[PDB]
Amino acid sequence: MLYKELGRTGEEIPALGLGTWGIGGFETPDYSRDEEMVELLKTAIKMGYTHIDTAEYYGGGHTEELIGKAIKDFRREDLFIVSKVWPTHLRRDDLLRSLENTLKRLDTDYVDLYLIHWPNPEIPLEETLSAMAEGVRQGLIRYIGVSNFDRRLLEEAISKSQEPIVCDQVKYNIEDRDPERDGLLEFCQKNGVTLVAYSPLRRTLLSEKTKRTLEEIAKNHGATIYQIMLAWLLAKPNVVAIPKAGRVEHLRENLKATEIKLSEEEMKLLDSLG
Numbered sequence: 001m002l003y004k005e006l007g008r009t010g011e012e013i014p015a016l017g018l019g020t021w022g023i024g025g026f027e028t029p030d031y032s033r034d035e036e037m038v039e040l041l042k043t044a045i046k047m048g049y050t051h052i053d054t055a056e057y058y059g060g061g062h063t064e065e066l067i068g069k070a071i072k073d074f075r076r077e078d079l080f081i082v083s084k085v086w087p088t089h090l091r092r093d094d095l096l097r098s099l100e101n102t103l104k105r106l107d108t109d110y111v112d113l114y115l116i117h118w119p120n121p122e123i124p125l126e127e128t129l130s131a132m133a134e135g136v137r138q139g140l141i142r143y144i145g146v147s148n149f150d151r152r153l154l155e156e157a158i159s160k161s162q163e164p165i166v167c168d169q170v171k172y173n174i175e176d177r178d179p180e181r182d183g184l185l186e187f188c189q190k191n192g193v194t195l196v197a198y199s200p201l202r203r204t205l206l207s208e209k210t211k212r213t214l215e216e217i218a219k220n221h222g223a224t225i226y227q228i229m230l231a232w233l234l235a236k237p238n239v240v241a242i243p244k245a246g247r248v249e250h251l252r253e254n255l256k257a258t259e260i261k262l263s264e265e266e267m268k269l270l271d272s273l274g
């Protein structure tokens with residue numbers, strides 16, 4: 001497992017996080033593979049997927065419940081657990097309730113990282129960030145961050161927050177390159193913010209052109225195309241990735257991607273795909 005520093009914390013985290021969207025349901029709870037999913041999560045944690053990405057929204061709360069069971073076989077302090085508050089709950093009292101229920105469902109006293117899941121232009125950022133600071137002061141949150149903030153909003157968040165904003169979790173992969181067009185990745189890299197790439201496999205939906213260049217490079221490393229697209233992200237400074245893998249095979253395969261060394265010319269060729 002590759003490790004990288006989170007923001008300017010002097011703390012390193014696993015550079016591959018464990019995406020949990022769809023585990024125990026999507027927008028609503030799905031109780032139908034609960035034992036299988038708890039066992040999957042335990043096996044991922046045991047393989048080294050100690051950085052876990054979840055949200056109150058996930059499975060209508062049930063994803064955090066399953067994660068809550070799975071983490072009982074491990075020392076809590078060895079795990080890096082990330083949750084998120086949905087844009088409907090960014091008002092102070094709603095945020096603190098969401099935090100509390102997240103903690104209840106995880107059955108733990110704190111989260112390692114807590115994110116604004118999406119910005120809500122109707123709720124002043126300063127209010128939301130100050131409520132999150134209360135969470136930190138109370139020992140309920142170790143670090144705060146944001147998600148789906150463009151460069152301007154990240155700047156605005158940084159100016160309005162007593163606590164450091166350690167990351168911006170955004171969509172970023174071999175095809176989806178809004179963080180490059182926005183100057184967001186450069187901003188993060190110059191200002192000690194970790195960019196966390198969600199949908200880092202683009203849910204496997206890729207054009208023919210990108211598949212063609214991915215295949216060449218994959219075979220040169222005797223890897224899969226998905227391994228190449230993870231290694232490409234991990235090769236960039238300040239970039240961490242959160243693939244979702246509901247199968248052992250993919251958990252194992254994606255872990256291997258942390259020991260691929262792409263050449264300079266392969267990096268340039270891959271950069272040229274979006």
Ligand SMILES: NC(=O)c1ccc[n+]([C@@H]2O[C@H](COP(=O)([O-])OP(=O)(O)OC[C@H]3O[C@@H](n4cnc5c(N)ncnc54)[C@H](OP(=O)(O)O)[C@@H]3O)[C@@H](O)[C@H]2O)c1
Pocket residue numbers: 018019020021022053054117147148169170197198199200201202203204224226227242243244245246247249250251253254
């Ligand atoms: N707003 C936000 O902040 C936001 C939005 C979207 C996602 N996220 C987070 O980011 C995570 C990942 O994003 P995502 O789930 O949207 O997309 P993703 O990780 O790009 O792709 C997930 C899909 O790829 C498959 N997969 C994974 N590894 C594979 C491999 N080696 N070979 C073939 N297929 C593979 C999975 O299948 P199997 O499950 O069968 O392995 C799943 O269907 C989510 O779980 C969530 O934690 C956050």
